[PDB]
Amino acid sequence: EAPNQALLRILKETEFKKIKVLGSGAFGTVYKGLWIPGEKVKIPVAIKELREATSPKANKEILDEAYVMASVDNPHVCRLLGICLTSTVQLIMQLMPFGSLLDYVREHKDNIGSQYLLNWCVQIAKGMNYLEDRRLVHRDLAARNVLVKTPQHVKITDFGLAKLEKEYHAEGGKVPIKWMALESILHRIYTHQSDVWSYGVTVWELMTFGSKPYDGIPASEISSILEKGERLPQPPICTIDVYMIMVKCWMIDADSRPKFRELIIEFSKMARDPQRYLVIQGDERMSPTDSNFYRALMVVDADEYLIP
Amino acid sequence: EAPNQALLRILKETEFKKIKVLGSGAFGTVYKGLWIPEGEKVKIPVAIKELREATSPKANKEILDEAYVMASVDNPHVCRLLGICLTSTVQLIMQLMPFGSLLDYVREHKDNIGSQYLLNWCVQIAKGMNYLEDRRLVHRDLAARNVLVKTPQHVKITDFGLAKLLGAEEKEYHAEGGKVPIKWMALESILHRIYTHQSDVWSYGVTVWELMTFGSKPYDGIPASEISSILEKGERLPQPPICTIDVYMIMVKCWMIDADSRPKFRELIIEFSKMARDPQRYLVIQGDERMHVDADEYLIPQ
Ligand SMILES: Cn1c2ccccc2c2c3c(c4c5ccccc5n(CCC#N)c4c21)CNC3=O
Ligand SMILES: [Cl-]
Ligand SMILES: [Cl-]
């Protein structure tokens, strides 16, 4: 092949501070974080820290993870800012100052634009197919995990990636029942076509402007309702053609579900004529702005600093 | 062009129960069923089609394609689906025509069929067809068995399983093999697996035949393989005794070898509608003068 000249940066624990715990696992936990660096600018980040300081196998995994993430390089997949070799290893993953898409969309639903909505689907499909070109399974696609660099540019977190042979099992605790494919629910296994299922759901959240999927429904019921053939309802904005794309992602059979390269083609094709495929009231006139998540930090994007 | 806001509704199978089987196919089965919408307090009669297996993506893709068309078309003589069921084997839920296939209907009631109805049915079939020509969709399996009778007054088209949608770029669609029965298909479709709206007209001509003869089998004696020869030989379906030369002529044009020569559906509505003004003249039937908790498709619409 070719040399992987990916830079790995080692940051001191003093350099970064962890605001709050976003998620927890049997091994390791993930914190919302602020990184400073002696520079004026502050950078929002996600930090993954091993729960346990002394497990050879866990340490081997966390280093491979840091190897893949640093190895990853795509406009729509979060860059790995660096790692810090405490006894408990931590990995720093860039976060965008404006925040996540899900929150962003709820804040701006009134002013939201149809072209932007089709454009985000093409972008997420690009990151996922990039990820899938290497044999890499995201295991958690959702609108909270899609980050807004700018309203035109979004990126998806690559934390906790699993690399393939056909399928990989994953146990962490705090699992997201609603976004997972039924196959994943019953047997706790994740494939690319399972990730597509989560992709379908993500698009739904975008289309409804951030309504909660299967809202007010217990997680135990969800596995059964999927067997009965219930699925998410049509987004009022959505055309039948767009909805069909979501429906195919929610097909019980894995192979029936669309492959990611397909999804990129389709959405870019619909992106050429967005107004025919998505109908939003007062669609023609609607503006880029700061976000509520971004307000709390009040920040600098990581990508701009690193450029020099 | 315009956005398609036709809406497809997902329904959990617990919402509907199946009282009885209307018909069997190798693809799968159609059930008579009562559908209760959750929350809503009405009972809707419905027909549910269910495939034999969810095993194959192609099977999966075609049903999803079929369901997409049946939801997107809205015509008074095109049967519409109420919703879909994402179960492992996908389920199709459609408005129920209680009476059944027209072909079934004609044989049982041959003694009572007035000339107007036969003309009135012909008009209605064409009207639905003509809509599908507008929608760029070729039905690809028209027969009196695929024409259902919600009521004698009203009839709707059915079984879009074979139907394919033409590309704007391409005037005609060609598909490998022939799933469909030979007798209905136009000669170009048998020889070259070519299908066009004009090829649908040919099948239309066979559907009218079936009505005018009260459902007798086309080329009833003949095995399917021979049929391609006889058409080339020039034999065709014989004059329905009830039929005048003016009406039968119309069926002749449909089974013309040259597809562009045969009538367009638009024409067929006007030609059969004009006959429908003065039916006795254009159709001769003995005793013709003598011859004449709730849910519905209507209910769903405002
Ligand atoms: C065979 N059959 C009937 C027989 C007696 C009474 C009704 C039907 C019927 C109906 C439908 C269908 C229908 C809808 C889509 C596809 C096929 C349908 N069939 C039979 C075709 C097969 N298989 C239907 C059908 C759809 N609504 C029906 O009533
Ligand atoms: Cl999370
Ligand atoms: Cl959940």
Curated annotation (Swiss-Prot), chain A:
Substitution effect: V72M: Found in a lung cancer sample
UniProt site (Important for interaction with PIK3C2B): Y305
Result for mutant: R276A: Reduced phosphorylation
Annotated catalytic residues: D140 (proton acceptor)
Annotated localization: Cell membrane; Endoplasmic reticulum membrane; Golgi apparatus membrane; Nucleus membrane
Protein kinase domain span: 16-278
Impact upon substituting Y305F: 50% decrease in interaction with PIK3C2B. 65% decrease in interaction with PIK3C2B. Abolishes interaction with PIK3C2B
Positions of modified residues (Phosphotyrosine): Y168, Y294, Y305
Any coiled-coil regions, as ranges: none
N6-(2-hydroxyisobutyryl)lysine: residues carrying this PTM: K48
Outcome following mutation: I10A: Abolishes phosphorylation
Effect of K48 to A/M: Abolishes kinase activity
Modification comment: Phosphorylated on Tyr residues in response to EGF. Dephosphorylation by PTPRJ prevents endocytosis and stabilizes the receptor at the plasma membrane. Dephosphorylated by PTPN1 and PTPN2.
Entry-annotated residues carrying Phosphoserine: S287, S291
Binding positions for ATP per the UniProt entry: L22, G23, S24, G25, A26, F27, G28, T29, V30, K48, M93, Q94, D158
Residues joined by cross-link Glycyl lysine isopeptide (Lys-Gly) (interchain with G-Cter in ubiquitin): K20, K40, K57, K60, K166, K228, K259, K269
Phenotype upon changing P3A: Reduced phosphorylation
Tissue: Ubiquitously expressed. Isoform 2 is also expressed in ovarian cancers.
Source domain of life: Eukaryota
Effect of G23C: Found in a lung cancer sample
Outcome of mutating L161R: Found in a lung cancer sample; somatic mutation; constitutively activated enzyme with strongly increased kinase activity; more sensitive to gefitinib than wild-type
Family recorded in the similarity comment: Belongs to the protein kinase superfamily. Tyr protein kinase family. EGF receptor subfamily.
Record: disease: Lung cancer: A common malignancy affecting tissues of the lung. The most common form of lung cancer is non-small cell lung cancer (NSCLC) that can be divided into 3 major histologic subtypes: squamous cell carcinoma, adenocarcinoma, and large cell lung cancer. NSCLC is often diagnosed at an advanced stage and has a poor prognosis. Neonatal nephrocutaneous inflammatory syndrome: An autosomal recessive disorder characterized by intrauterine growth retardation, premature birth, fragile skin, recurrent skin infections and sepsis, failure to thrive, nephrocalcinosis, and nephromegaly with tubular dysfunction. Some patients have chronic diarrhea, and necrotizing enterocolitis.
Function field: Receptor tyrosine kinase binding ligands of the EGF family and activating several signaling cascades to convert extracellular cues into appropriate cellular responses. Known ligands include EGF, TGFA/TGF-alpha, AREG, epigen/EPGN, BTC/betacellulin, epiregulin/EREG and HBEGF/heparin-binding EGF. Ligand binding triggers receptor homo- and/or heterodimerization and autophosphorylation on key cytoplasmic residues. The phosphorylated receptor recruits adapter proteins like GRB2 which in turn activates complex downstream signaling cascades. Isoform 2 may act as an antagonist of EGF action.
Subunit comment: Binding of the ligand triggers homo- and/or heterodimerization of the receptor triggering its autophosphorylation. Heterodimer with ERBB2. Forms a complex with CCDC88A/GIV (via SH2-like regions) and GNAI3 which leads to enhanced EGFR signaling and triggering of cell migration; binding to CCDC88A requires autophosphorylation of the EGFR C-terminal region, and ligand stimulation is required for recruitment of GNAI3 to the complex. Interacts with ERRFI1; inhibits dimerization of the kinase domain and autophosphorylation. Part of a complex with ERBB2 and either PIK3C2A or PIK3C2B.
Protein name stated in the entry: Epidermal growth factor receptor
Organism: Homo sapiens (Human)
Gene: EGFR
Residues represented out of the complete protein: 697 to 1019 of 1210
